[PDB]
Amino acid sequence: DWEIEASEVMLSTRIGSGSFGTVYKGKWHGDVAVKILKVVDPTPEQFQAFRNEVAVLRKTRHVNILLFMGYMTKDNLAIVTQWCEGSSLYKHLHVQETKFQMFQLIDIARQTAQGMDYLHAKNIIHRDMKSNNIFLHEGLTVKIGDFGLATVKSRVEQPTGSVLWMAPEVIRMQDNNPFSFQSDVYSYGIVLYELMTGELPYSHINNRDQIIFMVGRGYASPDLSKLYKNCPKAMKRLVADCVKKVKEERPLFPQILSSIELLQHSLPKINRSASEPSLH
Amino acid sequence: DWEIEASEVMLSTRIGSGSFGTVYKGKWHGDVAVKILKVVDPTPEQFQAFRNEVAVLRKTRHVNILLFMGYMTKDNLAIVTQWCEGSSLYKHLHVQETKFQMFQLIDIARQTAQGMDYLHAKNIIHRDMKSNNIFLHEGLTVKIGDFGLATVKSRVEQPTGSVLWMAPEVIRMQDNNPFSFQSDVYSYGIVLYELMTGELPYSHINNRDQIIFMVGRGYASPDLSKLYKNCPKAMKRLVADCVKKVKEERPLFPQILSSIELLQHSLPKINRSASEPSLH
Amino acid sequence: ELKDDDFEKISEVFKVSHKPSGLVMARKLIHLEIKPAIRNQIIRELQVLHECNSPYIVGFYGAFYSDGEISICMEHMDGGSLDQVLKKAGRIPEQILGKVSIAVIKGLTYLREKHKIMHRDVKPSNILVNSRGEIKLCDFGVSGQLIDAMANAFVGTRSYMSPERLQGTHYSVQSDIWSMGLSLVEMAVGRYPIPPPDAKELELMPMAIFELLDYIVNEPPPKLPSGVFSLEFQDFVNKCLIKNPAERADLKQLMVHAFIKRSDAEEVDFAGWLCSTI
Amino acid sequence: ELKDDDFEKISEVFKVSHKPSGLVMARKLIHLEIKPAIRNQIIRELQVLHECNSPYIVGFYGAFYSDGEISICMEHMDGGSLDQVLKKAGRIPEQILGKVSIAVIKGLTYLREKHKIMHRDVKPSNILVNSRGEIKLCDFGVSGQLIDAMANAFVGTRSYMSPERLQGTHYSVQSDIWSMGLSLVEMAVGRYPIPPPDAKELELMPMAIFELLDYIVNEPPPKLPSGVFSLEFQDFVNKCLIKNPAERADLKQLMVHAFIKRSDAEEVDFAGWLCSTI
Amino acid sequence: VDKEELVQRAKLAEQAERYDDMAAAMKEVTETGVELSNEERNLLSVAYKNVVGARRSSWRVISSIEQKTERKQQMAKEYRVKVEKELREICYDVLGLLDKHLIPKASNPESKVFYLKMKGDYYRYLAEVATGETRNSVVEDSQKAYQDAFEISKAKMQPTHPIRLGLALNFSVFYYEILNSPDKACQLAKQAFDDAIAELDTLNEDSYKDSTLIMQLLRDNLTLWTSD
Amino acid sequence: VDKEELVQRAKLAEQAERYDDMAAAMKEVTETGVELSNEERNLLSVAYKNVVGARRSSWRVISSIEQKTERKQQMAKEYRVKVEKELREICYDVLGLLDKHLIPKASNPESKVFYLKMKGDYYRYLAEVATGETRNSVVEDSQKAYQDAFEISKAKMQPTHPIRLGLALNFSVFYYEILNSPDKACQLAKQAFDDAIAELDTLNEDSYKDSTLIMQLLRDNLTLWTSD
Ligand SMILES: OCCn1cc(-c2ccc3c(c2)CC/C3=N\O)c(-c2ccncc2)n1
Numbered sequence A, B: 001d002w003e004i005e006a007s008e009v010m011l012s013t014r015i016g017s018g019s020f021g022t023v024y025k026g027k028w029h030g031d032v033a034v035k036i037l038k039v040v041d042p043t044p045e046q047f048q049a050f051r052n053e054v055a056v057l058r059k060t061r062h063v064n065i066l067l068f069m070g071y072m073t074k075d076n077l078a079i080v081t082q083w084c085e086g087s088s089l090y091k092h093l094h095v096q097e098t099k100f101q102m103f104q105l106i107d108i109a110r111q112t113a114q115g116m117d118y119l120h121a122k123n124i125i126h127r128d129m130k131s132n133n134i135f136l137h138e139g140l141t142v143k144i145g146d147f148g149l150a151t152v153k154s155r156v157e158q159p160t161g162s163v164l165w166m167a168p169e170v171i172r173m174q175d176n177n178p179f180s181f182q183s184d185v186y187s188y189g190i191v192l193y194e195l196m197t198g199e200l201p202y203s204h205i206n207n208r209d210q211i212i213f214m215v216g217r218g219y220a221s222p223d224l225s226k227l228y229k230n231c232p233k234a235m236k237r238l239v240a241d242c243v244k245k246v247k248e249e250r251p252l253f254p255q256i257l258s259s260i261e262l263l264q265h266s267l268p269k270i271n272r273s274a275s276e277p278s279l280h
Numbered sequence C, D: 001e002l003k004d005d006d007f008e009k010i011s012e013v014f015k016v017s018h019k020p021s022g023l024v025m026a027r028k029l030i031h032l033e034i035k036p037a038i039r040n041q042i043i044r045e046l047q048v049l050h051e052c053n054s055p056y057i058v059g060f061y062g063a064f065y066s067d068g069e070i071s072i073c074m075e076h077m078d079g080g081s082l083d084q085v086l087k088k089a090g091r092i093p094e095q096i097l098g099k100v101s102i103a104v105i106k107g108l109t110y111l112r113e114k115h116k117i118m119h120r121d122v123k124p125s126n127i128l129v130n131s132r133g134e135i136k137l138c139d140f141g142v143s144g145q146l147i148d149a150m151a152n153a154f155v156g157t158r159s160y161m162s163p164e165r166l167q168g169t170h171y172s173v174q175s176d177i178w179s180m181g182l183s184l185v186e187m188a189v190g191r192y193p194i195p196p197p198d199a200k201e202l203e204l205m206p207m208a209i210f211e212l213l214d215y216i217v218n219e220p221p222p223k224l225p226s227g228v229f230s231l232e233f234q235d236f237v238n239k240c241l242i243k244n245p246a247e248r249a250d251l252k253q254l255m256v257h258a259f260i261k262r263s264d265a266e267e268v269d270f271a272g273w274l275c276s277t278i
Numbered sequence E, F: 001v002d003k004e005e006l007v008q009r010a011k012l013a014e015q016a017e018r019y020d021d022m023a024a025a026m027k028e029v030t031e032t033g034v035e036l037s038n039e040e041r042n043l044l045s046v047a048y049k050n051v052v053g054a055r056r057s058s059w060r061v062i063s064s065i066e067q068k069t070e071r072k073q074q075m076a077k078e079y080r081v082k083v084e085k086e087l088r089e090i091c092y093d094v095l096g097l098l099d100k101h102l103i104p105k106a107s108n109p110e111s112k113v114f115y116l117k118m119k120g121d122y123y124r125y126l127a128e129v130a131t132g133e134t135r136n137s138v139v140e141d142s143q144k145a146y147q148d149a150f151e152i153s154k155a156k157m158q159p160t161h162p163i164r165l166g167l168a169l170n171f172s173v174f175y176y177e178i179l180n181s182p183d184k185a186c187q188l189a190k191q192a193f194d195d196a197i198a199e200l201d202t203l204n205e206d207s208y209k210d211s212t213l214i215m216q217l218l219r220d221n222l223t224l225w226t227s228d
């Protein structure tokens, strides 16, 4: 199927790390990216997570969803996917600090929303949506990144050690299966929030175990006034509705997609009123 | 698997046609494109071709290869794939007549060569490489289009009614199985030729059944002098070697890819010598 | 002015009648991608085809460019084309063939004397007889740009084509005459001129394109048996079918043929034989 | 000047010794993506940590930014940390605990009197004893920007954290003191302060993070049994562990404790007990 | 000889991006008194529009800096005086040429419409900076020329022609930026755009493409105005 | 008061893209006689480089048209005369200012290197159009200034500093475009680029990024020259 021989891949550089491995800019029929386990051993739990990763990536074929080229089991096990130009969205927000005009930002949101709708359509919970996952291929297009703990319905909860994007009900961990589409929706809302505030959520909160408690008990909430001054009001209300602490009132992804499409249809692309252009 | 329900897809417009169907700009989780059979009936031969199309598209996952989202069997059978911004390469060459700088042109060749190398790696013959198939998604990136008669090794020859790209040995049809990697290589060379001449191959020849005979008996050959004056000489020799009438002397795709990579490493990106730039 | 708006589809290249004029009309939906600047050229010569009418030529009406396609405004014909009518009826007697031959001969001479242009293609499917019994040959190679677009096109299953115009770029009207002679032979036999078939099939009355073209260019054109065809007919069609252009039947010696006179003198109502086929 | 070039890996946060100085050295490869402008800030305060030395604090060496990572240049310790040594040895007697308590108390007071900054985090894995027997507590919350980067980080399996600094943004040193009291209790028992376990386990000597935090904030801090701990020790550690900051053991009453005097007066060679554990 | 030579010079200059040169050249072209054709008036439009647009952008950016704001404020003010003097000089030259040789001698209706459009444009550009009685007079004159152009267009000119549509574009921007009446701009732009919609396919593709571009611009800016 | 006010005016002008204004302002800045710092000389560089680059592009395009070629040839020739006069005037002003107030009073080595680089650049720009004894004199003077700058750089300046690298870039382009000796350009550019390679990591990231940009430019143009 997508098996990959060990010798062919030409690993180049350690770009970064995270999520059960480290990323290399391999070379297999042009630019790729390889997620690789640092430890050589085939630990059964990480092996099973790898198998689930393979299956879920094989379940997806969308344009805005990372293109899983293959999985190699020989030597240290790895996943080879498309190399994405530019770094992740987290870098483009809080490391590059490149400005995003509201047109571009809403486009990014629309694309990634289409991606999430695709994952949900084939009955997959991403379970790990963040800003480190979103990748910005050139031309302002978007791809949803790793799906390491993303799984199908299968009708296990792991902190995955990623706070500020996890949902409060996911944090609370009462029913032993608190992973729903609305959890992914709340992750989406958090991504929108950090896109439209310019910083990470809950800036005033500092300590990690402080912020987990503050968002968990619900004492703390994202400060909507911290958003950009210049942004469409419908988008603001959509962010607020998507970040609702209560699960059932967060919007399912087709509805948020419809709202975003309405926003696109009512997008003031140019703040100034352009007149007669210089002919030809 | 990739089954698609009939009601969900929102077909919009007839962009064009060709290759066992007609193309519509559907709507299934964002922009798509649907190849659809005009006749409702499930003719067994076209059904089997459709099944082979499904299998071969499921065999491919590359970035420069068209992203097959799914295949729907209910009602009139169809394939849904990524919608590609901009028309095909044939349009961008002989309908848009937009100029391609040699940098951009060689980039297009490199990308599509990587794509062909991918098809060949998993043992697929495209068998139908043309300029109508190549699609130019925004940012000058490339995707290899339909694979309607593209098949795996399976170790049938059809004129497919597409002349000026078919290989002479494919035209001659002596062994009843004249479809090889070198046939695809020659198709690649013809695409390079039309990219680097600005017109269709064999312009002076007019009649179709004249040109089939002229290229078949070998009396006619592509006029290399008709290529662009401004182009790297290594590229010219690669085109000539790739368009060799004799099969065994045409280069296998990894070698042509290596030659193109060398060309990239020796690419004079700017004809003029840029000096000290205006600081910041 | 003419447009596809007032076009009511009837049957099947779609058979779509004209709404306001009350005339059943036909559209040729042969479409492909061309530069629009080239697309400017096609309409004007089709206007010239409209302004010319002959009693043995198709009805011509002004064509136009629709939303992405090139359509042709030709007349109706219950006879459709020759391919299916020969397929249903099988074979064709000498008299009908001779009358079709004189029809196509005088139509192409009408072309050569009016539009100063050669056929550039002749094909039995392009031969077609009116429901009331008139041969209305159509779709000439009048427009250069259309032929240029058709350079990039499908593969011809049976290219009834003159080998001299194939091998050498030196071409002449005699080549089209050889093509029409081959078309006449094909409609006579009822099958593609493969090498002469079994004596069984003759007593009763899949191959690749490139090797067929090789057969045409290399092997002699097929002969006509004398046990089913009159001696003058076969002799004259062979004369029209000779590969050497020196003894190809030019227009004058085309009308010279005695069987041409027999077809003119004979009475064959195409409508009657069509209804017998219909 | 210091760099990662002259760094020879030995063992494992990697244990990578210094090449030219001949000193076995340790690097903390805690890495994540930050704005480089923020990254400017971290090094200068680490220099301040280098210029301060205490007989009960880790060896400090100048840190630096490598090719995409933040490394820390700390001293070697065959004792490693407290977590694994308690895991191997099981539990710990009163004397060792008291000596560790005075070590951490005077180290944090040294911090509070020299660097004018609070610990901002206390953790038993951050408690560690030298191979020759010196408690060398390290990795303080000295650098604000590092703590800011660590805001976006993993989830803490057992956040030994003061509930008052959790719920309310009003925080004080007494909160860190409560944290260190909890760390002392944990190292005493040998397990996370879940509600008191079975009397079987006490006679012998998986839960989610958020509900653990809820237990800390809501339920009283766990008590220390008197059948395995001296009355003064448990009483004083409980006083240090009270949730109300009013009766939290400030530094002065921390040194006031009689068991502090017993630990000062007693003789416990950490090296001997380590070798017995080693 | 003079007219065609100067026109070729203007084409050489537009391929050279240097603008003062064909500014003077077309000034001399208009003062000659020959009835300008389509190409010559189009080149006039492009040249004058760009030579004023550069300075217009300069004024816009310096005004944004002034809004960003003590000595720097004074120097921004004096530089604003300079750029306003430049715009006034160049636009006054333009309008004087228009009402001297172009408007009075404009026989064909389309050139009259074109000149009225340009006149309204430059009156608008003055209104961008004009205040007090200056603003009053320039606004009144701009509106008079504007209503004149729209009347002559609706009387004897194609609704879906590029000139009438771009006309409407400039009407709408005038109503918003100067008249400060966004509603009137909204309805006028929408009604003209609907008139363009109705007869979109009446004309050929060559006009159709540019018409589509400019009505896309109309859609954009009307959405901008209704976004508030 | 004059110097800082004029400098703020120059910054306001670079945010305004209007160039003649800070051209005159920096002329007055240099004539004052104050020792220019890094920011002021950098602004001088940017302003003068762009104000000459616009006209340089104009001359390049009109020369391409002239090569494309009877009356049109004459008018292209006369317009070339105009643009050459403009370039000569502005560049002569630049060099006079340099050798009047900047070069003689330049105490620190880096500013001396900077001024020599600018002088060589403008001598090169003249050589672009100079012919006969004009070309001979300007080429000799440009080479003298160039070798002087390279000597002072290699004597007392950082090899991997941005100024020395961009120096080398302009040396290489001078050798190709003017001296017509592509080989000498090739080896000089390559050897300077290798010197930049050797000490790439000696400096901080802030210099490292711009150095990488300009040595990428060096790689590009050396590949251009070796492509032939
Ligand atoms: O610090 C993290 C930086 N970083 C992580 C990745 C990444 C993340 C997830 C996954 C892969 C790569 C490959 C497979 C996968 N999930 O399956 C990338 C990246 C991926 C593709 N193109 C460019 C960059 N950068």
Ligand SMILES: OCCn1cc(-c2ccc3c(c2)CC/C3=N\O)c(-c2ccncc2)n1
Pocket: B015, B016, B017, B018, B023, B033, B034, B035, B079, B080, B081, B082, B083, B084, B085, B086, B087, B088, B135, B145, B146, B147, B148
């Ligand atoms: O005249 C026809 C022009 N034309 C053909 C296609 C096309 C070709 C092949 C295939 C598909 C679409 C869909 C599936 C497929 N092969 O499987 C496209 C197109 C595809 C995607 N985005 C834009 C345009 N344009």
